[PDB]
Design an enzyme around this catalytic site. Structure first.
Site, PDB file in Angstrom:
ATOM      1  N   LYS A 153     116.484  43.739  69.327  1.00 45.26           N
ATOM      2  CA  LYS A 153     115.744  42.721  70.080  1.00 45.26           C
ATOM      3  C   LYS A 153     114.664  43.387  70.927  1.00 45.26           C
ATOM      4  O   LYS A 153     114.982  44.028  71.951  1.00 45.26           O
ATOM      5  CB  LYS A 153     116.676  41.897  70.971  1.00 45.26           C
ATOM      6  N   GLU A 181     120.190  54.057  78.097  1.00 41.21           N
ATOM      7  CA  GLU A 181     119.074  54.912  78.489  1.00 41.21           C
ATOM      8  C   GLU A 181     118.450  54.262  79.710  1.00 41.21           C
ATOM      9  O   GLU A 181     118.013  53.112  79.640  1.00 41.21           O
ATOM     10  CB  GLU A 181     118.052  55.081  77.352  1.00 41.21           C
ATOM     11  N   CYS A 206     109.126  55.780  80.464  1.00 41.33           N
ATOM     12  CA  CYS A 206     110.519  56.178  80.410  1.00 41.33           C
ATOM     13  C   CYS A 206     110.672  57.622  79.966  1.00 41.33           C
ATOM     14  O   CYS A 206     111.814  58.054  79.778  1.00 41.33           O
ATOM     15  CB  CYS A 206     111.310  55.246  79.468  1.00 41.33           C
ATOM     16  N   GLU A 241     111.237  54.337  91.939  1.00 38.83           N
ATOM     17  CA  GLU A 241     110.300  54.631  90.866  1.00 38.83           C
ATOM     18  C   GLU A 241     109.087  53.733  90.976  1.00 38.83           C
ATOM     19  O   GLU A 241     109.209  52.525  91.178  1.00 38.83           O
ATOM     20  CB  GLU A 241     110.952  54.466  89.485  1.00 38.83           C
TER      21      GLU A 241
END
Lengths: 474, 474, 472, 472
Positions: C185, C261, C295, C392
């Protein structure tokens, strides 16, 4: 601080076959000398073709299918190896003493360096014994394919005299951890610790015929092994001269697989950005360890012009303060050379280089009247084409060459016959990366020198089984 | 369905060095012949000691440090192996025709087996060139140690005539995918397939000198590669005698790494439980596939006495029914023998059998005049004593030996004194288990036969790098 | 130089099950926008739990024992993956164009790094498909034990929106390599690149149901596979929050294998012996590549005290010069941020830092309307206590901290609760040595910015056979 | 034959933290019973959240960067593991007796089976410690990439009572071998062999904090572990019920890595062609070993119809002649079950299958009045519908089924929810082949009843160094 074994009696001197101590088939016997005093330590049973045939028959028998050694669990081979790193441990002082005595190396180094390495080795393949894994492979079609490793069989191994007991563990231990049987000839100069291991092998209780130790000479015992019809693998270490003979005596023998570890040149690149005190001390241990009689260490030292003067000065102060004396005196850094044939060959080479325009900075002459002691010698302004450079000198001769550019020193160190190990001292990481990739060496040391599992493949062969299956699936 | 290339021209007959087609340095050529029609097909630039040197200098400069082939991404080494697989797949009809003419194998079989092997091989090792990994080793002390797998370099390879293109792909692909450069000499009998590969290699765009094809003879080009000093490794398939010669040629000069793929017997044990329709078949194809020219198949067939007469029945029926004839007749199963000298040593060995006690049940002579066609032959009532069962026949002869017990066969099968392969046909799992471990074989086949990673290990060299680190931390 | 596709008909908008393009069981669709313009680009079928079923069943029957994809040779699986790279090499421009318009990365970057990556991933993993090896083990007794690596099965994959196509490839190559089957997805922001792949996946000709693409929302479809009784593994990449719910959603549902992750800080450490030309730019392309949304990079930069002001000088010079504009302009280095929520959360934080004592050296605000374009900003004098160095920043924000000693810079980097990549710049071999060990970092890059992904897509089967008598 | 330690003094009854024996912070205590007699053996310091936080600080400290355990050479961690098997070997009879007494294992079984395994396990990883290798990876471009496996850190481990010591060895050796520290909680039934191992672990001289042992209960000590904030990896083994709980209690808490070793169904498949005398016994020992109390008790025995009667006839004779007795009597094969809960759980399940058509051929009720002994029972005519066939027994009940065809039994046997392990008894090599592959198992045995334990206690650190110019 440990102490050398006092009034050491050389108990073990006979041939070791089927865990029996046996006399030579001729009755002949040869002497073992003491390189420090040139005196004779004792006499031991010489081995010849007849004596070798015995040991081969024993080791083939101990390798036969129904045999204890063949039926054993892998982990029980690792146990026996581990029991012998125990026996080596409790006798560390005697094995270090008898090394000191037979082989001239200082007893403190023979203890904390040599014997130390014998024990870790035995422990390390002790653990490998039952972790030797084949693979299973996907194969197009309705098949299942997989791979067992299995011992090759009877291996004969010939070892030099540099590191008599360390060579010994280095060779026994993988061979056995893979499940082989062994027929080992220690050098004629230094059979003594080798033979003491034989009693330790009986004591940890390997099955008989599994480790057989035959002391004697290259032409006789050695050439017997190298050509025997009933030996599957021969593994030899020493002079490229004698090495050539083994390989031909093995294609004209039985095509037996053949391992040859031969000396090589060991260049020694020291850029200016290194810690000079560290490098002068490391390069001095890299040339003067085991009195230069180190098949793993070299003598071609490439110093960068910027630091060339100061380096020489530092190194010659190190040699001039480097204690040469009796191996059993605990302040001695450097013992004798192994024998007179070696003693002469090095002198003939020192005077060789002195007669080609090399600046002798110190040393270059013998030491005592008795023994085989050579003053630690330093040479300067060695060019590439000096004899002393083209031929490695297996003693306490430090030869310091000069270099100015990185690619220069790389092609220079590079040019070489087969065989080469490299050592660089730099802090520029880009310098270390370019050089260590550029060296055509098999071992490269960034900011050091020293005297594993790749040693296992070379004592086993791959058996492949493929079965046909009714309907293959993921 | 796929039909031989019509009016096939032999465009590629020169010598392949540095991606130039070239003539002999002596001007000389040599004949190549069509084993089916006995007719000479063309003439090829013979190679000799100086042609060899040409290609060794090519192959040493292309392996040099700055080289395109050395800088290349290992992932790109594999791209070229895949591009060549593309070209082979494209010209799969032309290649299988060339192999079928100059080699004598039926065209359909060269298209649907041989050629399928070629293409599968190059795609397999294209996938490996990316994945050759070294390892990091924890060591005692403040040190970091890792290994690199680096190409050995200039590899002389010497392949035979049994599977000309296959053996060419099986040797070239692993060495290339490891970063080597090749000097490969195809059989003097069968060099046209390997010359036509050069043209596909140029078209895939390998850097010149990374592969070099030198057709010629064993005594000239063969030994020339064996002794030549700038060849770091040699890899030879063929006669056991020629290989012993090479091992000496290689110790005497250069001490190169040496690899000897050498033939042998391949015992087939067909226990009674087997499916006889399958076993009579899998044991007939194992013997007669590629007309008997098979150093990956056998001639000794061991049948349990229970099913002996029923087996030699069904075997002689299939050999009566087996279709000889021209390689391009799409009904041919078996083609001719490779040339006269073999054709003759096969009939020699058939008459050897009849004059020693064999029950010849079928065949045994030549078929006509045209070419080197021998009838399909089945012997019977064979013992181990007979000289047809102690030395292998490289032709379409099926010998069948008796056995009764299982430990009986395990002993008779191991009796080559050398390395072989085995096969076993059973429904019982423990027989299959027992015999497969009891065999002294390199590969065992359970309920089948056939004509990977472990070829790769021989085509690179390990480099080790120990760094001195400022503190050890898990 | 290559040029975007002029008439970019977004042909592929339906969901993908059993290699059939399908509509929402509900009929509902959802919008997909262009962050360069804020314009709406098309309407794509929205997926939900009932779309996830059927999709899970597709994959379930495609993986059931007697199946093509199962009985297949692993080498053929290799060939399939290898054919995929071909089609992606063919439609490279197409798929870089669709990736640039939909996600806003510069189309030249789309063509030369993203697509570069995708093609190479499928090729590298074509080459693994057939070299996944088990293990024969010595075992005490009369026995014989070996190992097979076998696929896990139905694998729900949930990828984000940073590198939509690449991430799609990184997650599907290995799973299909090992012979798994996928219900993936892609981000609601960027389903477009992934639905194209579905076309080519069929053209190359995977067995129907071996891959299944699902466009829609995290809570709607992402939890649909996260808790789905018939999925064996879940493969999430995203925020530290959304994953914790996935990990729990599993423990309560099926005891699925769960990998997560999760983004973490990427501290750069530029010691003063480093090449300052190289450092100011390599740390400018680690912070500003892909418009910050990374990422596989991060925002904390620790520069040695001696080279501090000269760094931030050379850095603000790079950030002012950094060209911003339409992703299709061959000059644009930075394109927009992904959506307006992303846009705000950026500017919110840049206003956070100006309010905390961080010298705003460059940038700070938006650029224009009709699109999500933020000025390249640079902060100097950022402490560790500032909320912009604790949290972040997913945008074009380069914050620079000071450090005076090495054991000091190593203590500040490691300070992070979860995962982390670090990047060192030094010529000192020994400084490199100590920093790279001492970092509690997953990955460490010295002087820049495989199989261990394969072992995640297979389980181990072990077989021991009893044998009659054991011999070496 | 060896003799049990006489009048064993349980000397080690306190918590084990920092290589110091400590009382519980609350000072609470719990008792330990003898399952053969039901009499309490002793009391043990009960561990709770307070205690776990001492344990977790001691082990996190043992793992700190300059610690003995961290600067230690890998090979030394293996030396330590080797002294511990030495000491286990020295104390084989006290550890076997503790096991026989605390856990009700027949004493010879503990001595030659369990303790054999503890010792071999410690020896085997003792060899692994310095052979844990990383990778060097060819990488596109001017780069050098390589892998180092490194310990995950503090690992809290939780173990059942099936195989108290054996489960302790198997859990700790691979953890230690990789250089971790541990927080291990034995079952509350059977802490005793564990708590002794603390004395052994101090003896061989592991650094403090590297092994801390907390006895107590799932809801208190165990729950305080799975949720802890200072624990990097939870390693649980037991009922899939508590299993699910611990995976959720580790989403809501630092997202730590979880490992669940939960029960499952272990079918047997006896084809007619097998050696019935072998198969009948290996199937009997497959069920009744450790009094049915295996991690996956092989409850279902499919037997091919042609032998079905004669198999069950010989089976009942084997179960009828099985000696259920005191663990310390050397003629004993079957001991008591662990406690009343397990006991009547079993009696209720036996009363279940009787109430559903299964022909109880022997067994069915308890044994004596004191303890938790249960007659070895055997059921006939069992069907996949019956509850006793659908749900796992953790005790001495053998359930024998019929089957006709091979594909029938294959389809029937991997009809499990999750876990499965399988054993085939046959001489037909093709049958063995097809069944072992088509089994949805993770372990498959033919004709009977490691480093895949290492990677799980390491993580891969990746380092990529930029190089000036790459050559091969």
């Amino acid at each position: 601080l440990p102490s050398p074994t006092p009034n050491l009696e050389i108990k073990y001197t006979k041939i070791f076959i089927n865990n029996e101590w046996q006399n030579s088939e001729s009755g002949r016997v040869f002497p073992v000398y003491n390189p420090a005093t040139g005196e004779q330590v004792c006499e031991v049973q010489e081995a010849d073709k007849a004596d070798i045939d015995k040991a081969v028959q024993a080791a083939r028998l101990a390798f036969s299918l129904g045999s204890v050694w063949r039926r054993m669990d892998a982990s029980e081979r690792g146990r026996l190896l581990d029991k012998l790193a125990d026996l080596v441990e409790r006798d560390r002082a005697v094995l270090a003493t008898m090394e000191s005595l037979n082989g001239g190396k200082p007893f403190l180094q023979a203890f904390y360096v040599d014997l130390q390495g014998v024990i870790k080795t035995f422990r390390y393949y002790a653990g490998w014994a039952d972790k030797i894994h084949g693979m299973t492979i996907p194969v197009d079609g309705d098949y299942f394919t997989f791979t067992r490793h299995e011992p090759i069989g009877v291996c004969g191994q010939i070892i030099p005299w540099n590191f008599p007991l360390l060579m010994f563990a280095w060779k026994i231990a993988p061979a056995l951890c893979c499940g082989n049987t062994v027929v080992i000839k220690p050098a004629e100069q230094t059979p003594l610790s080798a033979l003491y291991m034989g009693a330790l092998i009986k004591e940890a209780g390997f099955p008989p015929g599994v480790i057989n130790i035959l002391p004697g000479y290259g032409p006789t015992a050695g050439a017997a092994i190298a050509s025997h019809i009933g030996i599957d693998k021969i593994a030899f270490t020493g002079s490229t001269e004698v090495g050539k003979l083994i390989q031909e005596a093995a294609g004209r023998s039985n095509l037996k697989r053949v391992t040859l570890e031969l000396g090589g040149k060991s260049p020694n690149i020291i850029f200016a950005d290194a810690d000079l005190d560290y490098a002068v001390e490391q390069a001095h241990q890299g040339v003067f360890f085991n009195q230069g009689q180190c098949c793993t260490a070299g003598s071609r030292i490439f110093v960068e012009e910027s630091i060339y003067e100061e380096f020489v000065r530092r190194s010659v102060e190190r040699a001039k303060r480097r204690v040469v004396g009796s191996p059993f005196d605990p302040t001695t850094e450097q013992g004798p050379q192994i024998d007179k044939k070696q003693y002469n060959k090095i002198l003939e080479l020192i005077q060789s280089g002195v007669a080609e325009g090399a600046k002798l900075e110190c040393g270059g002459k013998g030491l005592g009247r008795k023994g085989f002691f050579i003053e630690p010698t330093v040479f300067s302004n060695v060019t590439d084409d000096m004899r002393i450079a083209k031929e490695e000198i297996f003693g306490p001769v430090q030869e310091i060459l000069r270099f100015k550019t990185m690619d220069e020193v790389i092609e220079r160190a590079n040019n070489s016959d087969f065989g080469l190990v490299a050592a660089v001292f730099t802090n520029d990481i880009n310098k270390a990366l370019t050089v260590s990739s550029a060296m055509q060496a098999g071992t490269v040391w960034i900011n050091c020198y020293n005297a594993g599992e790749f040693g296992l493949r070379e004592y086993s062969e791959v058996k492949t089984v493929t079965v046909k299956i009714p309907q293959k699936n993921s």
